[PDB]
C-alpha cells in the first residue's frame, strides 16, 4: 500500500548536490521522476555552480535514492518503509587508485516528490587517472550486497567506470542507509542488481541524462540442503 | 564523455565563419595557405602554430593578449583548416615544414622569430629552429614533442591506439569514422564546445575519404625509437639535442593540468635550459580551457624577452 | 573438448601454506568438480599448525577459477590457459582493516588440478569474527570479471555471516595471469558464487566446501542507444 | 563453526569418568559437593574454582603443574557436574557462595587460602575475598567478574543475546536447547573438543529441563548498571572497592589472547594493585587451548608468592 506511506507508483524527485572535489568546489541540480515498483528512475542533471568540472562526470552518477527499486514480496523494502518521513545514507567510496570520497545524502519525501539533498567530496584522485582524465565513457552494471546491522542496512559493490581504451577502473562502495523512523521489518542478505546507463548524448543539450533500472532479489544458485550457512 | 558549457563562453564565441573572415589566404608553392595576421606590430613576430585535428581557430581566444606587443601569425597547415591542399596528396612531417617555410618567406618576417607551438605544431618549429638556428628568439611549446618516445610509462593510455591508427585500422578509423576530430577532439577538453564551436572543428573534415589524411598521417610519425618512422626519430633527436644545448635561447613551457601529454614531456622540457614553466588547467587542448591566463602567461613572458636590451 | 587435456568431471590437490599474524600452518585438499557447469567439492584437511586460532573460513576462497560455468556467449579464459594451467594474485581488505595476500599457482600433470596457495593474513583485530570464530559461513557473492590487456582482473565483496545474524564483509581483488597466450579474452561479465560447507557433523577433523561458480551477463537489458 | 583436533591432545585425553574416579564427594548443607583433592602440601591450599556451563573438568590440565607445590581443591558447584542440587533449586550468586564457604568449612584449610576463579568462579572467589578479608593470600582471575558493565564499548557482541536471556526467551534457550553447552562452550574454544571430553561436559546437563538451571541463572547475574540484578551488583561494586585497596594481596591476571572478555576487563584489572600480568592463547575457555602454558604460568606465580 503506498497511499498511506504518501507515495504511488511513479514518483517524481529533485536532487540537490554540494561538491567538493580537490579544491574545485561546485553546485549541481537533478529533476527527474520513476517507478518505486519497478526499480526504474531517469533524471537529468545539470551543473548550476563551478562550470566546467575539471573531473570526470560519472563520479557523481549514484549521488543521483534507493526507493527507486523493485523488491519482490519474499525480500521486505526497508526504503519504502523509510517513508513518508524519508531516509539518509553515508556512502564511503574508496577507487582502485587510493582516492576517496565522501557521500552524505538525506532523501525526504515532500508534497508529492523525493526531495534530496546530497554533500559529495572527493580527494587524492590521481592526474593520470581515469577522472582527471576523463576516460570514463559510463557505469557498468554491477551487485550491491544488502543485509541488515540492528537498525540501519549496509549495501557494499564495486562499481567498473568503463575506459574509451576498453579497460575498467574499479572502486569500492559501501553504503550505511539509516531510516529516519523506527521501520518495522528488517531484509534478510540479499543483492540489488544495478544498472545505470547514460540516454541522451546525440543531443548536445547541456544535460546529462541517466536512468538506473535497480532490481532486488536473492541468489539464483540453490542452496545444498546439507549447506551450512 | 558527458562535459558541460562554460557559463561566460558564448558571450565571446567566435563562430567558424567569424574568425575565417578575418584570415587571409596567400599563394605559397602549388597551393595557398590561410592565415590570421594582426600585421601591426610587424618589429617582432610571434607565430603560433597547431597540431592535429585543429587549425588557427585554437589560437582565437590566445591571440587577443599578444597582439598589442608583437604582430602574431598563426596559419592553418596545409590541408587543415581553410589551408589549401597538398600537391601530392602526402602530409607528412616533412610536406608541412615545407610548405610552412615557403609561407614563411613570403610574410617579411623579422630575423629572430618567436615561435608558439602545440603538439605537432610545436616539433615543426622545434625543425624549423634546429635547421634556422639563427632565426629564433624565444620559443614557447605546450603538450610538446620535446623528445622521442623510449617508454609508455607516465604517457596517457595511447599504446594499442596507435597502433591500430598505424596498423591499417587507421584507415577506417580516420578517414571513415573521423576518430580524431569526432572523438579525440572533444575527449581532450575540459568544457563542452558550443555547436558552433565545434562545427568550426569539423568543418575541414565534415566529408569522409582522403580529405581526412592529415588527421591520419599526424600521429603516423609518432618518435617512436622501437616500431616508429626513423625519419621522424632522427628529426626528433636532433632538435631535442639543439635544444639541449640551447642556452641563449629562451622558452616558455606551459604544462597542462592534469595534462594529456604533459606529464610525460615535462621532464624533457625541463633538461632544456633558460626555460620558464608555467601551469594552466586542462587536458590536451589547454587552449579552449584556459585561453585567458595561457595569453597573460604568453605575452608577459614576450614582454621579458623583448625587455632583454639589457 | 580434450584438446587442452582436461575431462568434463576433474580432480584436484590444493597445497596451502598460510601465516595469520604469527601462527604458520599448511593445509591439504582433495576434491572433484565439473568445470563445464563449474561446480566443486574439497575436503579440507590440516596437516601443520593445528588447532587454528583464527576463523576458517578465511581460507576458503583459496581453496581455481577453472570450476565456472561459462556459457557459449562469454569467453572462458580459464579453460583456455590449460593445460599449462594459470597463476592468480589476490588481494584482501577485511572491513576492519584487516589484509590478506593469496598468491595460488594451477598446473595439470596426470589428468588433475595441483594447485599451490600461499595465504598470509595480518592486522586482524582480536574483536573481529576472525580472531573471535563467530563466522558460520560465507554468503553467495557476484564477483566482476573483466579483461585488462592479457590478464583478468575479478573483485568482489564476500560476506561472512555471524553467530548473532550480523554480517562481516570484505573486498577482494584478484588478478588472473594465464601461462599460455589465451585466443579470446572476455569482456565484461560476473561470475555468481555460492560457497557452502556441507557434512557439518562432527566426525573427523576436516571440512568439506561446496563451490558453484556461474559465469554471466547483466539480467538487466541496456536500454538501445545509451551508453556506455 | 568449523574447528580442528589438537593433533597432540587424544594421547592425553582424560575422560569424565578418568576425571571422576579422581574425585571425591561430601555431605554440605542438604546436599553434596563433588571435588577433585590433591591432599600433598596440605600446609597451602590453592582452590580452582569453575564458571558457568563448565565443572571441575576444566582444570584437569591446569592442576598438575601446581599440585606438588601446593594442595589443590577444585568442586563442582552446586547442581553443576557430579555435585547434589541446591535445596530451594535457586542457583542465584548467593546460593553458590552459602554451598561454597559451607564446604570450605569442612576442608581443613589453612589460614590465608589461595583462589584460581574463572568467569563466575572468580565473582565468588571475590565475593568471599570481599567477606573473609583476611583469609586470602593471593588471588588467580582470568576472563572473570571484575566491576560492573556500564557502555558495551570493548565487549563482545553478547548484547540483546543477554536481553534475550533475561526475558522468556532465555527459558527455552538454555533449558529446552542447552544454548551455553551445545553452543556457548564449542564456540569459545579455538581447538575442537574430542567427543569424550565434550561429553564430560554435556552429562550434567544432557536432559531437557530444570536441571540446566544454573547456566540459565549465572548469565541472568550480570552485574549490569543499568537492568542488572542490584543485590549482585552491590556485591560486586563492594568487593571491587575492595579489590582496588588490595595493595598487599598478590594477584595475578591471565589474559587470553585474542579471549571472549580478555579485551573488555583487562584495562579494569589493571586497577588493581600488586597484579602481575601474563597472556596467553585461547577464547572464553583459555584452560582448554594453553593448559600447560597457564599451569608453569599459576605454579611460577605461587612458588614466588610464597617466597
Ligand atoms: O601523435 C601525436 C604527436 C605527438 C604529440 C606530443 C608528443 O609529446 C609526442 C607526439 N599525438 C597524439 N597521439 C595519440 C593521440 C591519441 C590517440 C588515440 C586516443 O584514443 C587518444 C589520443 N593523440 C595525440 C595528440 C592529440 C590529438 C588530438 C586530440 C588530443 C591529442
Known amino acids: 500500500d503506498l497511499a498511506k506511506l504518501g507515495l504511488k507508483e511513479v514518483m517524481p524527485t529533485k536532487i540537490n548536490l554540494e561538491g567538493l572535489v580537490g579544491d574545485h568546489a561546485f553546485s549541481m541540480e537533478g529533476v527527474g521522476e520513476g517507478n518505486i515498483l519497478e526499480g526504474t528512475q531517469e533524471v537529468k542533471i545539470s551543473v548550476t555552480k563551478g562550470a566546467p568540472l575539471p573531473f570526470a562526470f560519472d563520479i557523481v552518477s549514484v549521488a543521483f535514492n534507493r526507493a527507486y527499486t523493485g523488491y519482490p514480496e519474499e525480500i521486505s523494502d526497508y526504503f519504502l518503509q523509510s517513508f513518508p518521513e524519508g531516509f539518509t545514507y553515508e556512502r564511503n567510496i574508496r577507487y582502485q587508485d587510493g582516492g576517496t570520497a565522501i557521500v552524505k545524502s538525506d532523501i525526504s519525501l515532500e508534497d508529492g516528490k523525493f526531495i534530496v539533498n546530497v554533500d559529495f567530496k572527493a580527494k587524492d584522485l590521481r592526474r593520470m587517472g581515469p577522472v582527471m582524465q576523463q576516460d570514463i565513457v559510463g557505469m557498468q552494471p554491477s551487485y550491491e550486497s544488502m543485509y541488515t546491522n540492528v537498525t540501519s542496512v549496509i549495501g557494499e559493490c564495486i562499481i567498473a567506470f568503463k575506459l574509451q581504451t576498453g579497460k575498467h577502473f574499479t572502486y569500492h562502495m559501501r553504503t550505511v542507509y539509516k531510516s529516519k523512523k523506527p521501520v518495522e521489518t528488517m531484509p534478510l542478505y540479499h543483492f540489488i542488481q544495478h544498472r545505470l546507463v547514460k540516454t541522451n548524448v546525440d543531443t548536445a543539450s547541456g544535460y546529462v541524462v541517466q536512468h538506473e533500472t535497480a532490481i532486488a532479489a536473492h541468489s539464483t544458485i540453490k542452496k545444498i540442503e546439507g549447506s551450512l550457512p | ?310
Open chain 2, 1 to 310: 564523455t558527458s562535459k558541460v558549457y562554460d557559463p561566460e563562453q558564448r558571450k565571446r564565441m567566435i563562430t567558424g565563419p567569424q574568425w575565417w573572415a578575418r584570415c587571409k589566404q596567400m599563394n605559397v608553392l602549388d597551393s595557398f595557405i590561410n592565415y590570421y595576421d594582426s600585421e601591426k606590430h610587424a618589429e617582432n613576430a610571434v607565430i603560433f602554430l597547431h597540431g592535429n585535428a585543429t587549425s588557427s581557430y585554437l589560437w582565437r581566444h590566445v591571440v587577443p593578449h599578444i597582439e598589442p606587443v608583437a604582430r602574431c601569425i598563426i596559419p592553418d597547415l596545409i590541408g587543415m583548416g581553410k589551408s589549401g591542399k597538398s600537391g601530392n596528396g602526402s602530409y607528412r612531417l616533412l610536406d608541412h615544414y615545407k610548405y610552412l617555410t615557403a609561407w614563411f618567406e613570403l610574410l617579411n618576417l623579422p630575423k629572430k622569430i618567436i615561435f608558439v607551438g602545440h603538439d605537432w605544431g610545436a616539433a615543426l618549429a622545434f625543425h624549423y629552429a634546429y635547421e634556422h638556428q639563427d632565426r629564433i628568439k624565444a620559443i614557447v611549446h605546450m603538450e610538446s614533442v620535446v623528445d622521442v618516445i623510449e617508454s609508455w610509462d607516465e604517457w596517457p593510455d595511447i599504446e594499442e591506439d596507435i597502433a591500430l591508427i598505424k596498423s591499417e585500422e587507421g584507415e577506417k578509423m580516420v578517414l571513415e569514422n573521423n576518430f580524431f576530430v569526432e572523438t579525440v577532439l572533444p575527449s581532450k577538453i575540459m568544457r563542452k564546445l558550443e555547436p558552433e564551436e565545434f562545427a568550426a572543428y569539423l568543418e575541414p573534415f565534415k566529408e569522409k575519404g582522403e580529405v581526412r589524411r592529415p588527421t591520419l598521417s599526424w600521429p603516423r610519425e609518432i618518435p617512436l625509437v622501437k616500431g616508429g618512422k626513423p625519419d621522424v626519430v632522427q628529426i626528433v633527436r636532433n632538435y631535442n639535442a639543439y635544444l639541449r644545448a640551447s642556452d641563449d635561447l629562451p622558452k616558455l613551457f606551459i604544462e597542462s593540468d592534469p595534462g594529456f601529454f604533459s606529464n610525460a614531456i615535462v621532464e624533457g622540457a625541463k633538461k632544456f635550459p633558460n626555460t620558464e614553466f608555467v601551469k594552466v588547467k586542462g587536458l590536451h587542448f589547454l587552449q579552449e580551457d584556459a585561453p585567458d591566463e595561457m595569453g597573460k602567461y604568453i605575452k608577459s613572458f614576450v614582454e621579458r624577452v623583448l625587455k632583454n636590451e639589457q
